[PDB]
Write a protein that binds this ligand. Structure first.
Ligand SMILES: *[C@@H]1O[C@H](CO)[C@@H](O[C@@H]2O[C@H](CO)[C@@H](O[C@@H]3O[C@H](CO[C@H]4O[C@H](CO)[C@@H](O)[C@H](O)[C@@H]4O)[C@@H](O)[C@H](O[C@H]4O[C@H](CO)[C@@H](O)[C@H](O)[C@@H]4O)[C@@H]3O)[C@H](O)[C@H]2NC(C)=O)[C@H](O)[C@H]1NC(C)=O
Ligand SMILES: *[C@@H]1O[C@H](CO)[C@@H](O[C@@H]2O[C@H](CO)[C@@H](O)[C@H](O)[C@H]2NC(C)=O)[C@H](O)[C@H]1NC(C)=O
Length: 428
């Protein structure tokens, strides 16, 4: 078909309101198969407190807009004259993403979904992508979206100097836009590719979404149906199973590893903190705590400087100049009212300024030994993607500027601007 976010109708998506112990099941097409919800429920709410189900949005009472889906119901609200409703705002994203619970009134349940399905150009869409997250019994989110590559793949660790095993997470490997002459040899649509020198073989494609087996173990399975197999396996249909493991203790990142290769039925283990609860990895402020993240970080001191130099940071590039105002700091004059944490100014014409990240939209993340600060919600690019900036922090106890260091623009990839920043404040 292709009507109203097609690639999303293939699955039933969950979302949660942790403050109220509510687990939501979302099926934009209205067919999650939950007897307690009703056959046409589009948004079903599982009240875990009373263990009961209530549809809060019906697929047959849908109103669609460019980036908005509203589902009404015939259920009267606690507030007289109002019916229960559910509303999902869509924004362009680079991965399939997840429907994030935003808030709920007594009558309306609001969600926000940043997904490749809501972009203006099918350009960001993967050939095939599946849900890449799962909630545990405590309603904590285990999200692998950050590991999904929109270009290239991951070289898996094994012991075959004739085989090079490449995989992507929750989707096919983009072989067209690949810089590796090796990956550029893989078949399109493949999520797992075996390169036996001057030859590549699709040994797995995405089908089902990520699954949680234990509070610290996530499993993803790629398969292949029908004949036409490589046959080096002797009639065995290729299959790949990846087990993502959340380490009990923080540690440096490790590469996924091949633990089995029983003839076209590869098994990989990947120990990564991305498999842990998301709230253990992220903060919506410039600090991480030992209590919540097992790491103590505070970037607030980077927004302050001696009464001698600029109140903001300047990161020059070939055709643009970037001004960064971090952790509530002050912005450069040129980026006046704009309210941007990161602002891009065209060198050739300084009247062209684009917000590349807003202060109210920040995520400080620490996972697998890397500290990242992300500012999002910037002005939309032609693709519909709101500009965003990612600052890859690096520990350096003797970093210049008395430890504060300074941001260095390292490049742009489709409206996501990257910077590297060595600072003593990134030392864990
Ligand atoms: C889910 O439950 C809700 C809550 O009751 C219902 O929501 C109402 O839905 C109607 C549409 O059926 C809404 O009315 C429509 O609003 C559109 C937007 O209005 C704003 O923006 C325009 C910009 O052009 C302004 O002109 C306008 O003043 C507002 O600022 C309008 O564009 C629509 O206009 C079209 O229809 C009307 C007649 O309905 C024509 O006169 C016009 O020429 C034009 O063709 C329309 O007015 C209404 O606002 C919603 N109420 C809310 C949100 O509280 C849903 O209908 C229900 N779902 C289902 C399936 O029934
Ligand atoms: C992105 O930042 C904006 C503000 O900079 C947040 O959006 C605001 O949300 C409130 C309600 O919470 C609205 O009243 C405002 O109108 C919104 N601002 C505008 C003009 O868009 C948004 O919530 C931030 N994203 C997240 C998830 O933190």
């Amino acid at each position: 078909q292709g009507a109203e976010f097609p690639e999303l109708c293939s699955y039933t998506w969950e979302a949660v309101d942790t403050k109220n112990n509510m687990l939501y099941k979302i099926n934009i097409c209205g067919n999650m198969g939950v007897a307690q919800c009703g056959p046409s429920s589009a948004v079903c709410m599982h009240d875990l407190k009373t263990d009961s189900f209530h549809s809060v949005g019906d697929s047959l009472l849908k109103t669609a807009s460019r980036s908005l889906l509203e589902f009404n119901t015939t259920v009267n609200c606690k507030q007289q004259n109002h019916k229960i409703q559910s509303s999902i705002t869509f924004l362009c994203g680079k991965t399939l993403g997840t429907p994030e619970f935003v808030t709920a009134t007594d009558c309306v349940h609001y969600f926000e979904w940043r997904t490749t399905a809501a972009c203006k150009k099918n350009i960001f869409k993967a050939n095939k992508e599946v849900p890449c997250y799962a909630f545990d019994r405590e309603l904590k989110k285990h999200d692998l979206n950050p590991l999904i590559k929109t270009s290239g793949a991951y070289l898996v660790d094994d012991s075959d100097p004739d085989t090079s095993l490449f995989i992507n997470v929750c989707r096919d490997i983009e072989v067209l836009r690949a810089s590796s002459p090796q990956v550029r040899v893989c078949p399109t649509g493949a999520a797992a590719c075996l390169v036996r020198g001057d030859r590549a073989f699709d040994v797995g494609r995405p089908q089902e979404g990520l699954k949680l087996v234990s509070n610290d173990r996530l499993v993803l399975s790629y398969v292949k149906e029908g004949a036409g197999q490589p046959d080096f396996c002797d009639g065995h249909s290729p299959a790949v199973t990846i087990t993502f493991v959340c380490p009990s203790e923080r540690r440096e990142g490790t590469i996924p590893k091949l633990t089995a290769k029983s003839n076209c039925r590869f098994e990989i283990e990947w120990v990564t903190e991305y498999a842990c609860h998301r709230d253990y990895l992220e903060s919506r402020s410039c600090s991480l705590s030992s209590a919540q993240h097992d790491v103590a970080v505070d970037l607030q001191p980077l927004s302050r400087v001696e009464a001698s130099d600029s109140l903001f940071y300047t990161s020059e590039a070939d055709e643009y100049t970037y001004y960064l105002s971090i952790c509530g700091g002050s912005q450069a004059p040129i980026c006046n009212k704009k309210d941007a944490a990161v602002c891009q100014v065209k060198k050739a014409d300084s009247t062209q300024v684009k917000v590349a990240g807003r202060p109210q939209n920040l995520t400080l993340r620490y996972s697998d030994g890397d500290l990242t600060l992300i500012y999002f919600g910037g002005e939309e690019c032609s693709s519909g993607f709101q500009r965003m900036s990612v600052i890859n922090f690096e520990c350096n106890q003797t970093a210049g500027n008395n430890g504060r260091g300074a941001p260095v623009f390292t490049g742009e990839v489709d409206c996501t601007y990257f910077f590297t920043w060595d600072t003593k404040y990134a030392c864990v």
